[PDB]
Write a protein that binds this ligand. Structure first.
Ligand SMILES: *[C@@H]1O[C@H](CO)[C@@H](O[C@@H]2O[C@H](CO)[C@@H](O)[C@H](O)[C@H]2NC(C)=O)[C@H](O)[C@H]1NC(C)=O
Ligand SMILES: *[C@@H]1O[C@H](CO)[C@@H](O[C@@H]2O[C@H](CO)[C@@H](O)[C@H](O)[C@H]2NC(C)=O)[C@H](O)[C@H]1NC(C)=O
Ligand SMILES: *[C@@H]1O[C@H](CO)[C@@H](O)[C@H](O)[C@H]1NC(C)=O
Ligand SMILES: *[C@@H]1O[C@H](CO)[C@@H](O)[C@H](O)[C@H]1NC(C)=O
Ligand SMILES: *[C@@H]1O[C@H](CO)[C@@H](O)[C@H](O)[C@H]1NC(C)=O
Ligand SMILES: *[C@@H]1O[C@H](CO)[C@@H](O)[C@H](O)[C@H]1NC(C)=O
Ligand SMILES: *[C@@H]1O[C@H](CO)[C@@H](O)[C@H](O)[C@H]1NC(C)=O
Ligand SMILES: *[C@@H]1O[C@H](CO)[C@@H](O)[C@H](O)[C@H]1NC(C)=O
Ligand SMILES: *[C@@H]1O[C@H](CO)[C@@H](O)[C@H](O)[C@H]1NC(C)=O
Ligand SMILES: *[C@@H]1O[C@H](CO)[C@@H](O)[C@H](O)[C@H]1NC(C)=O
Lengths: 237, 167, 98
């Protein structure tokens, strides 16, 4: 069964790498619409679905442990066509775009930290990448936006400490870009990796929303940060 | 599979030649492995022709006081024109002021009075133009001496200044 | 004379007459850039201790780098060196995918 949550003003990211002073800039790009219904998945018993992409994904998560530990993107999630894999070790992220023979229920397996329960073939990858943090920089919300345009995968991320609330709090925080990968891959399906500790897990929960082509009006203050935005097709005001 | 020979006392034509075959292809990706752009140092406080990682333009480079967010390369002002960049090599923020300019007008009493003339360069500093070099506050008058007396307006120069044929 | 040319007359009465435009040209040029990064080592493929035999040849796929071909010009006389689709004097200013 589904379970929805109202995302009030979430998923506003920096559109370009340009400094702007106290300026109201009107942009038109893929944004998650204001006051929308994001889907609140649990996957905890263990049932994580293979969701579509369609135009980017806003992905929020509230987990103090390390369970939501990467993603799987692709078009058939099989061999004979390529697919992207983001795994997230304790020290570094390893993005890998190979012809993975993905298993039915993919998960990592920690004691030792193995990989053979995710896939079973790694033939002919043309892209590798290693960066340090990517994750974990009361509870802390972690928000990501993935969008694949013109062969470029763009991941935007922001990790913010929040108080106890609806896990998508009433406020505003702009998402700053993380990587920009030249993959050259058709991406239409994705799902999330987990770790299972060797069977038994904790309690996962992630919020998935979909980006749409919208016109926004962002307001940059003196220091070049975004403090407010207005969705030009929400209400009358 | 027959083994080669490769004794050292073979003629050139039976010697082991190593071979590397490079094959370049340009298939789909908008950006991949590419050669190295050249880099010539930058001059400060001079009107130069600049290129900052793709941004092509003209202007004077000066030390800035703006603060970019680690992911931003350049800034634009109101009216959407680039006004600051970050040097790719040294990672410093520099403002871009444009090369001075403005109209040039000639003040003449008429050839039936005299052939002298003075020239005002509108909001041009008298150090960036290329006797009597007065610096009005609405140009940069050359060819007339500025006095502290006052007379009736003759040839209006602008901003409460004037010129005229006297002695 | 520039004023007389602007008015298209030979008599210029009293007053400011706008004639021309003053624009400053730029001294020279300044192309600056970022230090450096990956250099996609040819060295390995042009200096291996054991080349593979001809029926079972290697195939190194070269990923993202800046590719200075000026090197590869410090190995010998190269009994050959035939570039086919490209001309070898222009290699340092082109982008390739694979
Ligand atoms: C790019 O490389 C240059 C190499 O010249 C770096 O410049 C040096 O940086 C160190 C660290 O602060 C200084 O101690 C040196 O004095 C600098 N060299 C000179 C000639 O001033 C530069 O910092 C590098 N930039 C980045 C972003 O890594
Ligand atoms: C090709 O390989 C040889 C051997 O690895 C390199 O020779 C080395 O050169 C460096 C610097 O010139 C010396 O410090 C080493 O002692 C050398 N090693 C040996 C075993 O002689 C040679 O430089 C390589 N070619 C290039 C262009 O790097
Ligand atoms: C979210 O879902 C509820 C119930 O399904 C619905 O009443 C509401 O209108 C939805 N929100 C939007 C913005 O459509
Ligand atoms: C994660 O991967 C990197 C290299 O891929 C490795 O150095 C590191 O040890 C791995 N993390 C763990 C916990 O094994
Ligand atoms: C990668 O290698 C496999 C060999 O199994 C081949 O089928 C595939 O076409 C190769 N990928 C590309 C992009 O050529
Ligand atoms: C990607 O999609 C486009 C259009 O949807 C299609 O033309 C192209 O063949 C696809 N590429 C692959 C590798 O499937
Ligand atoms: C951010 O802006 C405030 C004023 O709104 C200022 O006091 C503060 O110094 C700025 N921060 C930085 C790092 O410049
Ligand atoms: C200008 O010179 C002409 C003779 O060339 C004369 O007739 C006229 O009066 C002069 N004008 C003035 C203002 O002196
Ligand atoms: C012209 O530049 C000099 C410094 O070179 C400065 O002292 C002077 O005030 C400037 N004039 C104007 C009108 O700005
Ligand atoms: C005009 O008077 C001011 C003081 O009001 C003085 O500073 C300036 O030097 C005088 N100009 C001339 C040309 O004497």
């Amino acid at each position: 069964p589904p379970a929805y949550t109202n995302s009030f003003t979430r998923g506003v990211y920096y559109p370009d790498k340009v400094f702007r002073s106290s300026v109201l800039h009107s942009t038109q790009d893929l944004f998650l619409p204001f006051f929308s219904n994001v889907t609140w998945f649990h996957a905890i018993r263990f049932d994580n679905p293979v969701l579509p992409f369609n135009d980017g994904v806003y992905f929020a998560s509230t987990e103090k442990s390390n369970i939501i530990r990467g993603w799987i993107f692709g078009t058939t999630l099989d061999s004979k066509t390529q697919s992207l894999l983001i795994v997230n070790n304790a020290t570094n992220v390893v993005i890998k775009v190979c012809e993975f023979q993905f298993c039915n229920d993919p998960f990592l397996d920690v004691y030792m930290e193995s990989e053979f329960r995710v896939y079973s073939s790694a033939n002919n990858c043309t892209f590798e990448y290693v960066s340090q943090p990517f994750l974990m920089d009361f509870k802390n919300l972690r928000e990501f936006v993935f969008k694949n345009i013109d062969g470029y995968f763009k991941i935007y991320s922001k990790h913010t400490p929040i108080n106890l609330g609806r896990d998508l709090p009433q406020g505003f925080s702009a998402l700053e870009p993380l990587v920009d990968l030249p993959i050259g891959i058709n991406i239409t399906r994705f799902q999330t990796l987990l770790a299972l500790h060797r069977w038994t897990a904790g309690a996962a929960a992630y919020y998935v929303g979909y980006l749409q082509p919208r016109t926004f009006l962002l307001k940059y203050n003196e220091n070049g940060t975004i403090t407010d935005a207005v969705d030009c097709a929400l209400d009358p005001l | 599979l027959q083994s080669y020979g490769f004794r050292p006392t073979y003629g050139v034509g039976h010697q082991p030649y190593r071979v590397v075959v490079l094959s370049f292809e340009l298939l789909h990706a908008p950006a991949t492995v590419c050669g190295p752009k050249k880099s010539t140092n930058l001059v400060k406080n001079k009107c130069v022709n600049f290129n900052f990682n793709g941004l092509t333009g003209t202007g004077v480079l000066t030390e800035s006081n703006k603060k970019f967010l680690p992911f931003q390369q350049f800034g634009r002002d109101i009216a959407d024109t680039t006004d600051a960049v970050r040097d790719p090599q040294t990672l410093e923020i520099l403002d871009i002021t444009p090369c001075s300019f403005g109209g040039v007008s000639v003040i003449t009493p008429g050839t039936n009075t005299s052939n002298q003339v003075a020239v005002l360069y509108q909001g041009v500093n008298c150090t960036e133009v290329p006797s009597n070099v007065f610096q009005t506050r609405a140009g940069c008058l050359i060819g007339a001496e500025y006095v502290n007396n006052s007379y009736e307006c003759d040839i209006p120069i602008g901003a409460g200044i004037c010129a005229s044929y006297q002695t | 004379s520039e004023t007389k040319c602007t008015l298209k007359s030979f008599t210029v009465e009293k007053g400011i007459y706008q004639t021309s435009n003053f624009r400053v040209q730029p001294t020279e040029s300044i192309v600056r850039f970022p230090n450096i990064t990956n250099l996609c080592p040819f060295d390995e493929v042009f200096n291996a201790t054991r080349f593979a035999s001809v029926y079972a040849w290697n195939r190194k796929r070269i990923s993202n780098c800046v590719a200075d071909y000026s090197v590869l010009y410090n190995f010998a006389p190269f009994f050959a060196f035939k570039c086919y689709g490209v001309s070898p004097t222009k290699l340092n200013d082109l982008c390739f995918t694979n």
